[PDB]
Amino acid sequence: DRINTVRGPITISEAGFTLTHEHICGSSAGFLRAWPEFFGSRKALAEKAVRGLRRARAAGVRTIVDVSTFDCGRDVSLLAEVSRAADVHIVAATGLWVDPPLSMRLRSVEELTQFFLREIQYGIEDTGIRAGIIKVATTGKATPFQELVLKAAARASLATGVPVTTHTAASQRDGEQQAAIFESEGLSPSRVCIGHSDDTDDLSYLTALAARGYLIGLDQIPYSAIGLEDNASASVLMGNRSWQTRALLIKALIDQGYMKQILVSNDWLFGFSLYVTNIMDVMDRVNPDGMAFIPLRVIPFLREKGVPQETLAGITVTNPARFLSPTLR
Amino acid sequence: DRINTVRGPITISEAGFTLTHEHICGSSAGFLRAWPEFFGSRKALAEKAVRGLRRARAAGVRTIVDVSTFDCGRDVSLLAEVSRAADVHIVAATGLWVDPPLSMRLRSVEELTQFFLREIQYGIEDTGIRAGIIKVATTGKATPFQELVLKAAARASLATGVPVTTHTAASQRDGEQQAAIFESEGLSPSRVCIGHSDDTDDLSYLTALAARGYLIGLDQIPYSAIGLEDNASASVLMGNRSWQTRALLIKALIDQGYMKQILVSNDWLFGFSLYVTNIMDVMDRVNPDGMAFIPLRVIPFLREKGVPQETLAGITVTNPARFLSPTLR
Ligand SMILES: [Co+2]
Ligand SMILES: [Co+2]
Ligand SMILES: [Co+2]
Ligand SMILES: [Co+2]
């Protein structure tokens, strides 16, 4: 009945309005520490991030879940710093993303399980800060290594009650194989969110997962490259569908009986080193609201379309709490 | 005049007997910090390192060059720590190895140059410790990225007079492509060591490079998997030829008249996460002498084969000093 944050455990009520897939900095292990000038400076990155969280907070956001893993450039100390400065809860992640180093790629499923358990039960690095979620990733059919990561995440979840959240290629219908591997590990679908699921309009894929009891992460709502057509990065990054097209999936799933399975987010960041050098400026030009995009634009959008207050509050408050609070079922 | 160490700048004369290609911990960026228990613990790894350095110090070694890069898992405060406790100088490296993460893979040669210069002129991370060497790597034909890294290294070298050392697949004669690229950038061969050159029986390859002004890194002398040939990890890493065979190349280059171009080392480590998980113990079993193998085994071996004392001292003292002391030529 307690969710771990970068400032300690909080109760369920304290979580409140939660964004379930966000980042402070999108990068690689040690990159921020080794080359902060890439982000202007570590101080500039911090100030940017604090200003963003304060705006999100003014918009009603109380908690975010930072789903940056070790190899995804998680700097937990930075997460801790910005959290106290903005008074926004940040839940830190363990697991692995799509770019694990050789030191991880050579590990067994038993060692991977030990490491995830470390970051959950013991602490991240030497900070004593505990991960509150496990993040895994595939882009298309799982590699032999990604099979181990997924099995290991399932095992860490089953041992702690901490949930698993995923990065997918929705077009490749990644969730159907992620689901198959998790259920073979005996992991409850109620402990899993299949993310990036808003990247496609394939509703039959989404309700199949939602029917099994998975959580559906519609977590890139503001992502759109419309207007920035010839920008290579922004197109592979954000695709061609409008934000209103991504947000309609929320109503569509509400209308098929699955509002209790919907988690919503921006997948926003304040630093991003994994594309063209200036990808953060380009994303900022697309979404000047940042993390406040969900509460300022998406929530009113759905209200205008007839979705009651009661249902919206359930998606952004009740759903993340049920999901994040440690349990096996 | 001076060389950058992890304990600050030193006069050339303090360098003494220098091992020019070693490691404290061969890992991935942030890996020791995130998962210290892979190595027993950070303390255990540090004590093991300090034990090893002291033993090499008793054997005559005064300075090592640690050529772990960012992606090689360089932990520069660990290096400093073991340096102070064992009283052995340690020159730290910039550059990139064969495992750069995505945030590095996506950078341009001008960005890469910015990074290497960062770690030389400014410092590594936030430690104030400055690199005194640039390490780069190829494995057969340079990938498009590796081409950028080598060019970036040459430009950084040309800006600071700090030298470049390389990992190669010697049997593929990588030294020839590396050199062609280095020279296209206007970098003097006297600021470049072609490492891992003892992996080949082809002395023509070596003397051609030495004749061009290059230093030749006979830097893996204790490496051998004879007696454990069915250990796949050790075989790929260490090969199937004895240490004497590796050591006899030093004499062949000496007899050819190129003692001025030779640098010897062990390529030893105290921690190793980049292979099967116990690779370090397997290596310790093959070479209990560790970093003291060069002074304790290789030097008396070559003295016994009729190499003068002034030649062995010139290779382990003079050549490293002339290499590391900052110059463009
Ligand atoms: Co993702
Ligand atoms: Co994300
Ligand atoms: Co090497
Ligand atoms: Co090496």
XYZ file of C-alpha atoms and ligand atoms in Angstrom:
662
model
C 0.000 0.000 0.000
C 3.005 2.295 -0.563
C 4.540 3.662 -3.784
C 8.266 4.386 -3.827
C 9.370 7.744 -5.197
C 12.760 9.449 -5.513
C 12.048 11.224 -2.196
C 10.795 8.139 -0.379
C 7.566 6.102 -0.205
C 4.237 7.896 -0.555
C 0.666 6.764 0.060
C -1.888 6.225 -2.698
C -3.719 9.488 -2.028
C -0.462 11.438 -2.265
C 0.060 10.198 -5.842
C -2.973 12.002 -7.223
C -3.002 13.038 -10.868
C -0.196 10.938 -12.323
C 1.483 10.869 -15.716
C 2.639 7.285 -16.130
C 5.245 7.535 -18.925
C 7.518 10.557 -18.818
C 11.214 11.462 -18.808
C 13.408 14.132 -17.306
C 16.293 13.256 -19.633
C 16.331 10.833 -22.579
C 19.902 9.673 -22.981
C 22.459 6.882 -22.380
C 24.124 5.555 -19.225
C 26.631 8.103 -17.890
C 26.147 10.448 -20.861
C 24.748 13.357 -18.850
C 27.566 13.086 -16.288
C 30.219 12.704 -18.980
C 28.989 15.344 -21.412
C 26.544 17.810 -19.781
C 27.439 20.489 -22.345
C 25.338 18.496 -24.805
C 22.297 19.698 -22.832
C 23.743 23.194 -22.486
C 24.902 22.381 -18.957
C 23.696 20.190 -16.112
C 22.357 23.357 -14.445
C 20.422 24.456 -17.514
C 18.917 21.005 -17.897
C 17.878 21.031 -14.246
C 16.310 24.509 -14.484
C 14.461 23.573 -17.668
C 13.119 20.433 -15.999
C 12.058 22.196 -12.780
C 10.204 24.867 -14.761
C 8.453 22.136 -16.748
C 7.345 20.188 -13.659
C 6.074 23.364 -11.978
C 3.904 24.140 -15.014
C 2.622 20.568 -15.126
C 1.938 20.898 -11.391
C 0.046 24.155 -11.897
C -2.030 22.208 -14.439
C -2.954 19.627 -11.800
C -0.198 17.008 -12.164
C 1.073 15.731 -8.816
C 3.207 12.791 -9.856
C 5.118 11.586 -12.877
C 6.672 8.202 -13.548
C 10.097 8.582 -15.144
C 10.507 5.507 -17.328
C 14.195 6.090 -18.125
C 16.165 2.929 -17.378
C 19.870 2.433 -16.770
C 20.670 2.235 -20.502
C 18.080 4.932 -21.248
C 20.245 7.440 -19.391
C 18.472 7.542 -16.020
C 20.263 9.912 -13.660
C 18.407 9.239 -10.413
C 20.250 12.021 -8.550
C 18.934 14.500 -11.117
C 15.457 13.011 -10.700
C 15.760 13.497 -6.954
C 16.986 17.085 -7.346
C 14.164 18.203 -9.654
C 11.522 16.414 -7.593
C 12.280 18.284 -4.366
C 12.704 21.590 -6.213
C 9.298 21.368 -7.946
C 7.410 19.379 -5.292
C 6.358 16.806 -7.882
C 6.574 13.114 -7.078
C 8.771 11.164 -9.460
C 8.715 7.373 -9.590
C 12.017 6.011 -10.878
C 12.393 2.953 -13.096
C 14.493 -0.183 -13.330
C 14.670 -2.595 -16.249
C 16.292 -2.165 -19.640
C 15.405 -0.248 -22.805
C 16.462 -0.763 -26.468
C 20.149 0.164 -26.089
C 21.760 -2.051 -23.449
C 25.576 -1.993 -23.270
C 27.764 -5.085 -23.753
C 27.969 -5.447 -19.975
C 24.212 -6.036 -19.923
C 23.911 -7.908 -23.211
C 26.109 -10.677 -21.856
C 24.056 -11.258 -18.745
C 21.808 -14.236 -18.063
C 18.117 -14.015 -17.169
C 19.084 -14.862 -13.565
C 21.582 -12.002 -13.382
C 19.144 -9.623 -15.062
C 16.574 -10.596 -12.420
C 19.143 -9.895 -9.661
C 19.891 -6.449 -11.040
C 16.209 -5.459 -11.362
C 15.624 -6.679 -7.814
C 18.636 -4.633 -6.709
C 17.246 -1.403 -8.093
C 13.798 -2.199 -6.644
C 14.645 -3.599 -3.207
C 18.035 -2.139 -2.416
C 18.485 1.076 -4.353
C 19.573 2.709 -7.582
C 23.354 2.925 -7.692
C 24.567 4.049 -4.270
C 21.684 6.446 -3.519
C 19.363 4.082 -1.654
C 16.548 5.286 -3.921
C 14.256 2.437 -4.934
C 12.657 1.923 -8.350
C 8.855 1.912 -8.322
C 8.340 0.373 -11.766
C 10.118 -1.932 -14.240
C 10.378 -0.742 -17.868
C 11.108 -3.097 -20.753
C 11.305 -2.635 -24.518
C 10.950 -4.242 -27.941
C 10.727 -2.834 -31.461
C 9.236 -5.672 -33.476
C 9.851 -9.331 -32.651
C 11.906 -9.751 -29.482
C 15.636 -10.429 -29.860
C 17.015 -13.373 -27.856
C 18.267 -10.823 -25.284
C 14.936 -9.001 -25.090
C 13.292 -12.344 -24.257
C 15.576 -12.604 -21.206
C 14.864 -8.988 -20.166
C 11.113 -9.594 -20.370
C 11.321 -12.854 -18.403
C 13.519 -11.138 -15.848
C 11.128 -8.210 -15.471
C 8.256 -10.624 -14.992
C 10.203 -12.373 -12.234
C 11.176 -9.139 -10.475
C 7.547 -8.023 -10.595
C 6.305 -11.328 -9.194
C 8.821 -11.029 -6.340
C 8.039 -7.437 -5.351
C 4.613 -6.516 -6.706
C 6.193 -3.668 -8.635
C 4.631 -3.251 -12.115
C 6.103 -3.710 -15.578
C 5.607 -1.084 -18.280
C 6.674 -1.482 -21.917
C 8.001 0.361 -24.939
C 6.522 -1.095 -28.121
C 6.254 -0.644 -31.834
C 2.457 -0.672 -31.958
C 2.571 -1.137 -35.742
C 4.446 -4.418 -35.176
C 1.772 -5.425 -32.636
C 4.498 -5.876 -30.033
C 2.060 -6.303 -27.166
C 0.836 -9.685 -28.356
C 4.333 -11.210 -27.900
C 5.162 -9.199 -24.777
C 1.908 -10.588 -23.388
C 2.765 -14.158 -24.434
C 6.148 -14.090 -22.649
C 4.747 -12.450 -19.491
C 1.886 -14.948 -19.147
C 4.326 -17.816 -19.621
C 6.080 -16.366 -16.565
C 2.773 -16.385 -14.700
C 2.676 -12.606 -14.412
C -0.777 -11.083 -13.956
C -1.798 -8.809 -16.840
C -3.078 -6.403 -14.142
C 0.591 -5.708 -13.386
C 1.486 -4.793 -16.976
C 1.052 -1.718 -19.152
C 1.627 -2.140 -22.894
C 2.841 1.297 -23.866
C 3.196 3.346 -27.046
C -0.099 1.706 -27.920
C -1.511 4.968 -29.275
C 0.854 4.842 -32.246
C -1.701 2.919 -34.281
C -5.471 2.971 -34.908
C -5.680 -0.842 -34.789
C -8.474 -1.102 -32.192
C -8.754 -4.891 -32.424
C -5.175 -5.181 -31.161
C -5.898 -2.816 -28.262
C -9.123 -4.409 -26.998
C -7.569 -7.885 -27.185
C -4.989 -6.778 -24.614
C -7.508 -4.787 -22.591
C -9.753 -7.868 -22.503
C -6.914 -10.001 -21.125
C -6.715 -7.368 -18.391
C -3.591 -5.498 -19.472
C -3.237 -1.798 -19.020
C -3.102 0.226 -22.238
C -0.559 3.023 -22.408
C -1.692 5.771 -24.742
C 1.381 7.730 -23.841
C 2.621 9.767 -26.814
C -0.484 11.931 -27.382
C 1.302 15.177 -28.328
C 3.618 13.373 -30.808
C 3.002 14.538 -34.346
C 5.267 15.605 -37.189
C 2.518 17.372 -39.159
C 4.081 20.551 -40.573
C 7.601 19.257 -39.976
C 7.159 16.712 -42.767
C 10.722 16.593 -44.117
C 12.358 16.519 -40.687
C 13.722 12.972 -40.662
C 14.033 12.569 -36.892
C 10.642 14.090 -36.029
C 8.866 11.765 -38.487
C 10.344 8.465 -37.278
C 9.941 9.865 -33.776
C 6.442 11.281 -33.925
C 4.664 9.886 -36.961
C 2.019 11.434 -39.195
C -1.133 11.257 -37.087
C -2.440 14.309 -35.245
C -2.665 14.492 -31.460
C -6.464 14.477 -31.705
C -6.160 11.143 -33.524
C -4.073 9.707 -30.680
C -6.481 11.120 -28.079
C -9.582 9.680 -29.761
C -8.222 6.246 -28.879
C -8.935 7.164 -25.265
C -12.632 7.780 -26.004
C -12.815 4.767 -28.311
C -11.510 2.506 -25.497
C -13.795 4.191 -22.960
C -16.676 3.415 -25.321
C -15.752 -0.273 -25.545
C -15.903 -0.711 -21.784
C -12.215 -0.419 -20.903
C -11.806 2.970 -19.120
C -10.235 1.217 -16.084
C -7.391 -0.052 -18.293
C -6.384 3.293 -19.783
C -3.204 5.092 -18.719
C -2.426 8.436 -20.386
C 0.780 10.455 -20.721
C 2.923 12.707 -22.936
C 6.159 10.728 -23.068
C 7.714 14.167 -22.686
C 11.358 14.943 -21.784
C 13.534 17.938 -20.931
C 16.736 16.495 -22.377
C 17.017 14.093 -25.297
C 20.316 12.826 -26.756
C 19.052 9.815 -28.752
C 18.243 11.489 -32.094
C 19.451 14.515 -34.055
C 21.326 16.850 -31.710
C 18.517 19.417 -31.466
C 15.555 17.027 -31.267
C 14.402 18.654 -28.016
C 14.069 22.081 -29.622
C 12.046 20.501 -32.420
C 9.751 18.665 -29.977
C 9.329 21.877 -27.973
C 8.197 23.628 -31.167
C 5.560 20.915 -31.600
C 4.421 20.877 -27.982
C 5.167 24.120 -26.139
C 3.000 22.811 -23.250
C 5.402 19.987 -22.427
C 4.027 17.692 -19.723
C 1.061 20.020 -19.220
C -0.201 18.861 -22.628
C -2.355 16.109 -21.115
C -4.103 18.308 -18.509
C -4.309 21.498 -20.627
C -5.256 20.141 -24.050
C -6.166 16.423 -23.937
C -8.469 16.563 -20.895
C -10.563 19.469 -22.261
C -10.603 17.741 -25.653
C -12.265 14.669 -24.164
C -14.653 16.774 -22.069
C -15.862 18.631 -25.174
C -16.591 15.196 -26.683
C -18.865 14.252 -23.778
C -16.493 12.253 -21.553
C -17.619 12.990 -17.969
C -15.405 14.454 -15.249
C -15.882 11.241 -13.257
C -14.350 9.143 -16.050
C -11.435 11.493 -16.655
C -10.583 11.538 -12.944
C -10.643 7.748 -12.996
C -8.175 7.538 -15.882
C -5.630 10.018 -14.467
C -5.910 9.277 -10.718
C -7.563 5.938 -9.889
C -5.909 3.989 -12.713
C -2.286 4.999 -11.995
C -2.798 4.247 -8.263
C -4.209 0.762 -8.835
C -1.360 0.142 -11.279
C 1.536 1.556 -9.198
C 0.582 0.251 -5.758
C 2.562 -2.980 -5.111
C 0.526 -6.175 -5.449
C 0.743 -9.437 -7.384
C -2.903 -9.217 -8.470
C 56.841 19.225 -19.840
C 53.842 17.734 -18.012
C 51.413 14.812 -18.254
C 47.825 14.650 -16.945
C 47.218 11.997 -14.261
C 44.188 11.154 -12.120
C 46.042 12.868 -9.231
C 46.811 15.952 -11.347
C 49.748 16.893 -13.621
C 53.192 15.326 -13.252
C 56.618 16.112 -14.702
C 57.736 13.624 -17.346
C 60.488 12.349 -15.062
C 57.996 11.117 -12.451
C 56.498 8.670 -14.944
C 59.275 6.084 -14.730
C 58.559 2.499 -15.761
C 55.191 2.932 -17.498
C 52.749 0.265 -18.660
C 50.999 1.923 -21.608
C 47.861 -0.200 -22.012
C 46.105 -1.448 -18.890
C 42.708 -1.213 -17.172
C 41.451 -0.970 -13.618
C 37.956 -2.043 -14.604
C 36.798 -3.078 -18.083
C 33.072 -2.469 -18.069
C 30.389 -0.265 -19.622
C 29.521 3.369 -18.836
C 27.768 3.630 -15.461
C 27.818 -0.150 -14.934
C 30.111 -0.322 -11.875
C 28.131 2.518 -10.315
C 24.766 0.833 -11.042
C 25.728 -2.762 -10.269
C 28.852 -2.875 -8.027
C 27.989 -6.368 -6.741
C 28.945 -7.760 -10.134
C 32.507 -7.138 -8.910
C 31.890 -8.302 -5.348
C 31.549 -4.662 -4.396
C 33.138 -1.327 -5.244
C 35.326 -1.667 -2.114
C 36.413 -5.205 -2.981
C 37.270 -4.158 -6.546
C 39.221 -1.205 -5.182
C 41.217 -3.327 -2.723
C 41.914 -5.911 -5.432
C 43.154 -3.150 -7.708
C 45.314 -1.601 -4.964
C 46.801 -5.025 -4.187
C 47.641 -5.511 -7.859
C 49.118 -2.079 -8.384
C 51.312 -2.410 -5.279
C 52.617 -5.744 -6.541
C 53.452 -4.188 -9.900
C 55.062 -1.282 -8.007
C 57.290 -3.647 -6.031
C 58.273 -5.097 -9.406
C 59.327 -1.663 -10.638
C 56.214 -0.147 -12.260
C 55.606 3.529 -11.429
C 52.879 4.540 -13.894
C 50.096 2.816 -15.806
C 47.952 4.140 -18.648
C 44.301 3.067 -18.252
C 42.758 3.050 -21.707
C 39.166 2.479 -20.631
C 37.014 4.981 -22.504
C 33.540 6.322 -21.637
C 31.928 3.299 -23.290
C 34.711 1.144 -21.826
C 33.377 1.805 -18.346
C 36.079 4.209 -17.167
C 35.253 5.200 -13.569
C 37.664 8.057 -13.060
C 37.188 8.499 -9.307
C 37.952 4.814 -8.796
C 41.159 5.330 -10.784
C 42.108 8.297 -8.581
C 41.349 6.305 -5.456
C 43.468 3.250 -6.311
C 46.168 5.614 -7.574
C 46.503 7.343 -4.205
C 46.386 4.119 -2.174
C 48.965 2.154 -4.131
C 51.106 5.157 -5.077
C 51.142 4.455 -8.809
C 50.509 7.152 -11.413
C 47.522 6.487 -13.643
C 46.926 8.318 -16.919
C 43.222 8.252 -17.831
C 41.755 8.049 -21.333
C 39.238 9.750 -23.527
C 37.994 8.467 -26.890
C 35.521 5.718 -27.734
C 35.817 1.965 -27.817
C 33.882 -0.653 -29.804
C 30.671 -0.204 -27.813
C 29.515 3.428 -28.059
C 25.895 3.921 -26.921
C 23.216 5.573 -29.090
C 23.846 9.061 -27.686
C 27.386 8.692 -29.045
C 26.578 6.810 -32.246
C 24.388 9.693 -33.392
C 27.034 12.402 -33.030
C 28.983 14.082 -35.821
C 32.792 14.221 -36.004
C 32.679 17.859 -34.799
C 30.575 16.840 -31.832
C 32.954 13.925 -31.174
C 35.938 16.277 -31.294
C 34.128 18.511 -28.805
C 33.739 15.550 -26.450
C 37.328 14.305 -26.592
C 38.669 17.852 -26.108
C 36.214 18.273 -23.242
C 37.779 15.353 -21.401
C 41.347 16.575 -22.152
C 41.236 20.352 -21.641
C 38.366 20.584 -19.111
C 38.069 17.277 -17.283
C 36.232 13.976 -17.171
C 32.657 14.375 -15.881
C 32.746 16.752 -12.908
C 36.023 15.510 -11.413
C 38.542 17.998 -12.781
C 40.608 14.983 -13.875
C 41.945 15.333 -17.414
C 42.665 12.609 -19.963
C 46.262 12.185 -21.055
C 45.563 9.905 -24.001
C 42.884 9.197 -26.622
C 41.838 5.649 -27.136
C 40.023 4.512 -30.297
C 39.093 1.095 -31.706
C 38.392 -0.857 -34.881
C 37.635 -4.524 -35.573
C 38.455 -5.097 -39.211
C 37.211 -2.453 -41.642
C 36.190 0.746 -39.838
C 32.435 1.247 -39.645
C 31.229 4.703 -40.765
C 31.038 5.680 -37.080
C 34.581 4.475 -36.327
C 35.858 6.623 -39.191
C 34.314 9.630 -37.453
C 35.861 8.632 -34.112
C 39.368 8.259 -35.601
C 39.111 11.624 -37.343
C 37.796 13.196 -34.133
C 40.721 11.656 -32.219
C 43.265 13.000 -34.717
C 41.827 16.510 -34.488
C 41.713 16.383 -30.688
C 45.307 15.122 -30.667
C 46.365 17.874 -33.069
C 44.803 20.446 -30.741
C 46.364 19.287 -27.467
C 49.469 17.266 -28.364
C 47.956 14.389 -26.373
C 48.649 11.066 -28.177
C 46.334 8.435 -29.677
C 46.320 4.714 -28.812
C 44.324 2.082 -30.701
C 42.607 -1.300 -30.340
C 42.954 -3.379 -33.508
C 42.284 -6.771 -35.005
C 45.978 -7.132 -35.943
C 45.396 -10.174 -38.163
C 43.197 -7.975 -40.357
C 45.966 -5.384 -40.564
C 43.698 -2.652 -39.148
C 46.794 -0.562 -38.478
C 47.020 0.245 -42.180
C 43.514 1.759 -42.452
C 43.815 3.564 -39.094
C 47.117 5.102 -40.209
C 45.719 6.130 -43.596
C 42.870 7.936 -41.858
C 45.136 9.457 -39.154
C 47.458 10.788 -41.905
C 44.560 12.164 -43.952
C 43.898 14.343 -40.910
C 47.505 15.546 -40.801
C 48.318 13.691 -37.578
C 51.975 12.700 -37.093
C 52.540 8.941 -36.722
C 54.748 9.717 -33.670
C 51.581 10.583 -31.738
C 49.934 7.219 -32.444
C 50.306 3.713 -31.084
C 48.825 0.831 -33.063
C 47.836 -1.503 -30.240
C 47.058 -5.215 -29.985
C 49.834 -5.792 -32.503
C 51.250 -8.829 -30.724
C 48.297 -10.889 -31.982
C 50.047 -11.408 -35.335
C 53.017 -13.390 -36.715
C 53.269 -10.890 -39.586
C 56.407 -8.886 -38.823
C 56.250 -7.103 -42.218
C 52.986 -5.473 -41.142
C 54.665 -4.304 -37.938
C 58.025 -3.014 -39.276
C 56.299 -1.092 -42.078
C 54.256 0.750 -39.460
C 57.313 1.267 -37.183
C 59.308 2.497 -40.185
C 56.534 5.046 -40.796
C 57.021 6.542 -37.330
C 54.277 4.665 -35.513
C 54.548 3.176 -32.067
C 53.728 -0.522 -31.897
C 51.609 -1.754 -29.011
C 52.782 -5.207 -28.040
C 50.256 -4.943 -25.231
C 48.608 -8.315 -24.563
C 51.675 -10.426 -23.752
C 50.209 -12.627 -21.008
C 47.069 -13.411 -23.071
C 46.708 -17.131 -23.842
C 43.928 -19.713 -23.697
C 46.170 -22.754 -24.065
C 45.039 -25.282 -21.458
C 41.489 -23.941 -21.561
C 40.845 -23.942 -25.317
C 37.219 -25.048 -24.846
C 36.458 -21.863 -22.956
C 34.809 -19.930 -25.789
C 34.976 -16.554 -24.079
C 38.667 -16.856 -23.175
C 39.613 -18.232 -26.593
C 38.115 -15.328 -28.538
C 39.685 -12.919 -26.045
C 43.107 -14.504 -25.507
C 43.819 -16.616 -28.591
C 45.787 -19.837 -29.025
C 49.445 -18.729 -28.895
C 51.755 -18.730 -25.868
C 53.007 -15.644 -24.053
C 56.590 -16.372 -25.158
C 55.444 -16.158 -28.789
C 53.874 -12.774 -28.033
C 56.989 -11.767 -26.108
C 59.315 -12.860 -28.912
C 57.815 -10.211 -31.236
C 59.390 -7.571 -29.034
C 62.792 -9.090 -29.790
C 62.035 -9.328 -33.528
C 61.175 -5.612 -33.720
C 64.284 -4.856 -31.660
C 66.479 -6.890 -34.017
C 64.929 -5.078 -37.000
C 66.224 -1.825 -35.500
C 62.971 -0.380 -34.187
C 63.301 -0.488 -30.401
C 62.364 3.214 -30.386
C 58.897 2.317 -31.657
C 57.975 -0.378 -29.134
C 55.534 -0.074 -26.236
C 54.793 -3.140 -24.115
C 51.946 -3.856 -21.682
C 49.713 -6.589 -20.235
C 46.223 -5.295 -21.116
C 45.364 -6.457 -17.611
C 42.326 -5.564 -15.499
C 41.078 -6.112 -11.972
C 37.406 -6.169 -12.982
C 35.787 -7.386 -16.191
C 32.070 -7.286 -17.042
C 32.425 -7.515 -20.812
C 32.536 -11.324 -21.235
C 31.216 -14.429 -19.493
C 30.633 -13.298 -15.934
C 33.738 -14.935 -14.378
C 36.168 -14.008 -17.146
C 38.314 -12.100 -14.659
C 38.907 -15.201 -12.545
C 39.733 -17.208 -15.662
C 42.307 -14.564 -16.606
C 43.761 -14.517 -13.079
C 44.152 -18.296 -13.384
C 46.079 -17.868 -16.630
C 48.201 -14.987 -15.277
C 48.489 -14.874 -11.467
C 51.160 -12.151 -11.889
C 48.582 -9.744 -13.297
C 50.109 -6.376 -14.178
C 53.456 -7.445 -12.729
C 53.705 -10.020 -15.553
C 55.638 -7.622 -17.777
C 58.375 -6.785 -15.237
C 58.418 -10.204 -13.527
C 58.150 -12.520 -16.555
C 58.688 -10.691 -19.868
C 61.782 -8.623 -18.954
C 63.794 -11.512 -17.512
C 62.710 -13.629 -20.496
C 64.107 -11.104 -22.965
C 67.265 -10.504 -20.922
C 67.810 -14.280 -21.070
C 67.351 -14.153 -24.867
C 70.138 -11.579 -25.072
C 68.325 -8.240 -25.109
C 70.521 -5.620 -23.319
C 69.370 -3.956 -20.093
C 69.472 -0.510 -21.732
C 67.119 -1.725 -24.470
C 64.552 -3.081 -22.008
C 64.739 0.097 -19.952
C 64.465 2.230 -23.080
C 61.277 0.413 -24.087
C 59.603 0.721 -20.671
C 60.880 4.186 -19.695
C 62.094 6.248 -22.656
C 59.443 5.258 -25.186
C 56.454 5.869 -22.896
C 57.896 9.247 -21.866
C 58.434 10.350 -25.469
C 54.947 9.082 -26.353
C 52.983 10.738 -23.549
C 54.844 14.068 -23.358
C 52.597 16.474 -25.325
C 53.758 17.433 -28.837
C 52.483 17.479 -32.421
C 55.662 15.764 -33.594
Co 9.696 4.417 -25.611
Co 9.451 7.002 -23.152
Co 41.391 -3.613 -26.741
Co 42.615 -2.843 -23.373
